[PDB]
Design a protein around this ligand. Structure first.
Ligand SMILES: NCCC[C@H](N)C(=O)O
Ligand SMILES: NCCC[C@H](N)C(=O)O
Ligand SMILES: NCCC[C@H](N)C(=O)O
Ligand SMILES: NCCC[C@H](N)C(=O)O
Ligand SMILES: [Mn+2]
Ligand SMILES: [Mn+2]
Ligand SMILES: [Mn+2]
Ligand SMILES: [Mn+2]
Ligand SMILES: [Mn+2]
Ligand SMILES: [Mn+2]
Ligand SMILES: [Mn+2]
Ligand SMILES: [Mn+2]
Ligand SMILES: [Mn+2]
Ligand SMILES: [Mn+2]
Ligand SMILES: [Mn+2]
Ligand SMILES: [Mn+2]
Ligand code: NA
Ligand code: NA
Ligand code: NA
Ligand code: NA
Ligand code: NA
Ligand code: NA
Lengths: 316, 316, 317, 318, 316, 316
């Protein structure tokens, strides 16, 4: 009624905001010349699919402040210039809270996040890097990348958790279920999960069902050489990388909802990302919880540096 | 100039979104009936006019979380029910960071902010409670309130500092120059400044020159009775309440950019607000810096409860 | 079968026997020194599971004891009593609440154990119980136990941001938000003065009006302060019980709470009320200190400890 | 007089042991009624910190550990796949009421004897095996003594710690947390003592290791020693293996909530590489020296302590 | 024993260092003059007479950083300019840890503290404001001011504690015996102890024995009107103010070694200082413990603003 | 002009204080007999050459406290006894803030630091270990060591940053330029920078210009065997080791002005220091920022243990 049409006008004005801002970043990259791919940040400030704490809703603006901190320089480790738009642009945040606040259901909210990602991909040669937000957001992002490209992607999923519960606590959009949604829908072929150390019988059974390659930290000593020399995406249209910050031991990343000892070092993660051979078509950095971070924002710098090194990898 | 016209498509859509949200809230309040005035939150995540720290840019979403925290109930001290839209609605945040990012200068930003305030006012019978954001925003909110209403207002300005510097560090939009801009444009008649304990010889000269009633904490013992029995707005369009969070002793409100000992207690602030007779037309809660808050968000709960009590006074 | 309830009973009985043996030694110490009319004895009830928001008060009583004896402090109360005199303060320790919960004991029988533990202290004359919470749910079994033992209602001074008189908060009758409904329902309290109230809803006020509760809100503290720094309670009944939720204090003074509620009393405001109260105090509690929410140096532990020290000087005589 | 004092204390001690015995009896009956278990980890808390040389914070640890084991952020499966809500995998007989026993004047010899008897009460309920939550490292002595006396012979011990804890009498306290492994080696309770993660030791510690034939692995040789330490075999021919983990075996990056910050320690993953690969019939274990008052505001060291307890439980239970 | 020539030239070089900087500060003040009194800061970074924590050793450099923090203005509540050397100069810190390390005894160390205070006074028109350090430093500072002026002073002593034990734990220089030492020496006519709330039998007896006026917080309701209208020094050499930061409720000043609930507000102390009628000849601000302070240095700001307000009272 | 006269009397007393203390330590070392080399701590509390925060100004006293903490023992990892003066003495802190305050320029302040180092070196057989302070101090320290020994040294520089900017933000004494100053003076033959992970085009170009061996964390897997087997100083005057605490991953060393994820573990650094073959003639531990440390001083312990293990290596 009056309501459904009111909701459509807020949704439409939200998509228009992303569309106009993408257009300006696309024109800016196309004007400078030569880029084959150019990382564009899209923020999805959503936390209500979280099982424990909703703090990731507040992450994307903290991440951006950390990327540009006066304490850092603008060069990535392998020497890309983050001030160059062909390396990194930013189309801003999906207005999630404003959409929820007007009574929009999750089916439609997640549809708006997909469309938001399509708006970036439709500006050549931008490729999306999504700032979460809780891990529920990887389903509408991966769906949007798969649909746009016209086939399943191979995924590298860095996570303490496999996020492959059929329906965690009745919520099909649970942050603990988004890789079940992705695999059910035929949006991914290979799913490599690395850093896994919190998994139950359902996680293992769902892993076998979907053909997932689950690397547990209890075999990391033996798996490290293979994980520091990954080659992904041959025979599919691209590779997507999803990083839950909780792939890192809490010593490196305390600013997470799920503290799970025995994880990767920051340098372990960069060894995997730097050495990965892959046509990276998209990526996300999720589950940064600023409310659980240190008083000085150490996990914000962790999330920012992951974003920066993913941008170097995506942009070419 | 393809970008200069493109800036306008970002602004148009930015304001479109505020209006589309404003109408839905408008409609729900008019459906319910009986409201003369209805507090509607409008966030202004702007901190780049700050002299020391830009942390208030992150405040409005934290304030909103604290209002609805499971630890609290939805009753105000007086007994007003915050779940009733006649009492409180929220039109969300102005996308200041997106606007800044598409290269728009401060003139047009502050005008977009003024226009956004006007969009809420044009939806009867909503009255704007702006969540700052640094002090800089009061000037465009007040100008927009003063323009819409057709003439000057009187201001209750609760703050440790007086913020009437002519031009502070060469920025005319400085959070320290905001009330100099307001007085200069005759948007205010009586400016009552309360909780003042950080003032310089320029602060006093400008206060006399604009005929400002500056109450210093030095005389609070004698002043309390007068301060706890205030009446304002007779002969004017209305009364604007600008509450900088540092009016409170840092013991109550650590989460600010300027720690200034010898402040008000939270109860002192409620004594003043509960007792003040005013036609309140507009109110801001500013300078709340989450990056300076306690790990448990004590200042977020302070900001939230001042918003709640301010909304129980504005709503009628 | 009923092998379950009987096994639970053996654990409950052993739990109560341990409080009995501890209370006896403290009793015998106070009697052997001689001259006490009343001797504050601490009983901890490390219980958090009736909270609506955070269960951290389950951990408070050990932290409060540490703060009472911190080497940064001396052993004198403000009005000059010696806390090292067992006649002024003793400690019978903690009800083993978690271990009773862990063997499947329901809340009715668990609250019965708390009551029975309070009686066991009262039955070593001249001990009077000062209970360390724990969440505010515990005041119900404590006040029930004191009233039943003294054989009549008491007057209660209740210092709290919240009135805690929901008929059944979230369906739990033992909710920390319902303990003073449970108390007034049972006729264990004649007068109930609630002081520091600044978070209350229509049901709060309707339940206030129903049970004859005197609700002093902070929006009228300027006016009410003279009368509140001059209380007299308990005349014509068995005595006065003082319940202090640490959230009566503004969070500036007491951040270590589950419910941050700006606009509360100063610590000095609470000692003015306590010091000047005229009352034969038969029991007290300090509840809702949440160590998990405290500063890293334990400021709220020192607050809860000093409230305990000033209540002990008041109860001991 | 002053001998009647000892009789009142004995009433508190007996009431304390009776309470542990009754809790242990329900846990043993539950495990046995479910059937099939050969061994079932049962937690025993010993909230003792007064033998500490710097901070007594470990007295507050056991309840914080239990909370973290059941934290709603976590799931109930161990890394290897054991279900912690199965009583045959984990039960909990609660805490020894240490503070109350100290508070009625009981001397340290009698208090440590209570800790020993409490451990035996768990072991007496077949098939429970004790996993002790400290508490400072002093408690390892009475625990290891009870396990050895009850099994009727020596155990091999894996001791994970920044410190060897083998001073004869640290600051005149024979029950010092820095002397508990001297107490253990003097009593004949151990065949092998392997000390892993050592990085704070002096000549007295090295001399005491030689005197008792302790095998001391220092972090300065961890590059060389790692393969050996990640393939340990212990307890063949004796009553089994006891594992004592001082949380300060971990670099303080991983475990800040300790009284003794000693940079250059093991990663959490390094410790699980050692535990997971250890071949051992583990007859008991402890997790000690978690200091909640030195932890982060979010309890990161509580979650470290809890995950060590959970992984040990998965190893003890079978 | 060539340690004597060393100990001696270490001491001489320490004293030289203060003489030289006093000479420069004096010259700068008279250079453009018309000042009767000018406040000069002297740090005594001494904490080893503390009974619990020694953290006050580190305070004086932290107080200086807070006085000149970019978040603050250079004007005092009354309106004096701290950049004006006539109002405030700074002669740096007595090298206490350096004198300690060469094996010098507490008797001689405290003499150095005394000598160092006289160096500031010997340089007209400088008046010493000492940044502690623990409360032991007040004995030698008051000794120096009294001997230099040749007569006793009236002393306003703000503290949770009376610091008047005969020999706390066997140390006659205990921070808990400074006022026993002062009273035994005849340096004070009147001693007013304000904010007392941790006192035992020995505290009351020593008080009665020395004629000390002990204001306990439990009578502050009745004493406030009187404490906010003091008059001291009339007839004797002048007024010394000693301020233990723990005079303030820990809500206002958590950065102390002794947390003692139920203290004064920051505005309470300012009401006492602003209305104190007195010729103030010296003052100290002691027992700030930076190791117990909040992460953002609230108590540092609290000690700095006491120093700034004291300097506005002392300078003229 | 008598200002200039004043400054020289202050510098002289400042040097006179280091001379006399170093005399007492040399005499003590010489009287115990047998030492070839004896580590002597010299503190340089200087932060104003920092680009981001001046916290390291406060570091040296907090390091000393950590070295002697009652939670620790006095043996190093390889068994040296820190209470033996032949293993460790301390000549205390260059009075940096007193020299700045009397208006001395950075040229002369840096020369004072050089002179303070030589005063240690002139007391046989002390060798200097300097506690920073920000990285700017390495230049005047190495310049003094090289001038004193009459030739160049090899340097091991442990840092996240190369600090080799020509003129970072206009300041030739920038903490980000001190190795450009060192390499321009010919004070060093080899400069091995280890743990580098924040470097731009200028850092790389300047590295090539001065022949710097730049070991980046992105090749640490490959490089680790060679870095745990270093031999330096053969055919030159010896080896100087500079340790920026931010060489460590912020997981281990959060108390730094520059959070840079993906660094060395503590054990990594000790594997390098313990296996290094070198005649170490001097060392520094710089850029510990206590205002960014944990509430319990974790980074203070890290800095203390680096100092302790360097002392074991320097003393012989
Ligand atoms: N994304 C994190 C989900 C955590 C959940 N407790 C699990 O079992 O994984
Ligand atoms: N709004 C804050 C203004 C602070 C400024 N340093 C001043 O001197 O006023
Ligand atoms: N300066 C503080 C002294 C504190 C001591 N516990 C006392 O009894 O006063
Ligand atoms: N377990 C901690 C003991 C620490 C002691 N300072 C030692 O030297 O071992
Ligand atoms: Mn996930
Ligand atoms: Mn995860
Ligand atoms: Mn302002
Ligand atoms: Mn302000
Ligand atoms: Mn309550
Ligand atoms: Mn309450
Ligand atoms: Mn140990
Ligand atoms: Mn240890
Ligand atoms: Mn004092
Ligand atoms: Mn004091
Ligand atoms: Mn550096
Ligand atoms: Mn660096
Ligand atoms: Na989450
Ligand atoms: Na600001
Ligand atoms: Na609670
Ligand atoms: Na300990
Ligand atoms: Na002290
Ligand atoms: Na720095």
């Amino acid at each position: 009624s009056s309501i459904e049409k009111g909701q459509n006008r807020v949704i439409d004005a939200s998509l228009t905001l992303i569309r106009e801002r993408a257009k300006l970043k696309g024109e800016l990259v196309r004007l400078l010349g030569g880029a084959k791919a150019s990382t564009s940040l899209l923020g999805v400030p959503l936390g209500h699919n979280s099982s424990f704490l909703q703090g990731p809703a507040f992450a994307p603006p903290r991440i951006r402040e950390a990327i540009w901190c006066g304490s850092t320089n603008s060069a990535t480790e392998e020497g890309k210039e983050l001030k160059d738009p062909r390396v990194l642009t930013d189309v801003g945040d999906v207005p999630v809270q404003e959409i929820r606040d007007c009574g929009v259901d999750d089916d439609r909210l997640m549809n708006v996040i997909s469309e938001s990602v399509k708006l970036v991909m439709e500006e050549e040669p931008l490729r999306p890097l999504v700032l979460g937000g809780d891990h529920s957001i990887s389903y509408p992002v991966v769906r949007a990348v798969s649909e746009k490209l016209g086939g399943p992607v191979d995924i590298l999923h860095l996570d303490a958790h496999p996020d492959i519960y059929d329906c965690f606590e009745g919520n099909k959009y649970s942050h603990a279920s988004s890789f079940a949604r992705i695999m059910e829908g035929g949006y991914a072929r290979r799913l490599l999960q690395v850093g896994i150390r919190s998994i139950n019988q359902e996680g293992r059974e769902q892993g076998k069902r979907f053909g997932v390659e689950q690397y547990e930290m209890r075999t990391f000593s033996k798996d490290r050489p293979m994980l520091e020399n990954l080659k992904l995406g041959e025979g599919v249209k691209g590779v997507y990388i999803s990083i839950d910050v909780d792939c890192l031991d809490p010593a490196f990343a305390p600013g997470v909802s799920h503290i799970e000892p025995g994880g990767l070092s920051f340098r372990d993660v960069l060894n995997i990302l730097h050495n990965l051979q892959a046509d990276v078509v998209g990526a996300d950095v999720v589950e940064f919880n600023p409310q659980r971070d240190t008083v000085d924002g150490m996990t914000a710098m962790v999330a920012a540096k992951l974003v920066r090194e993913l941008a170097a990898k995506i942009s070419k």
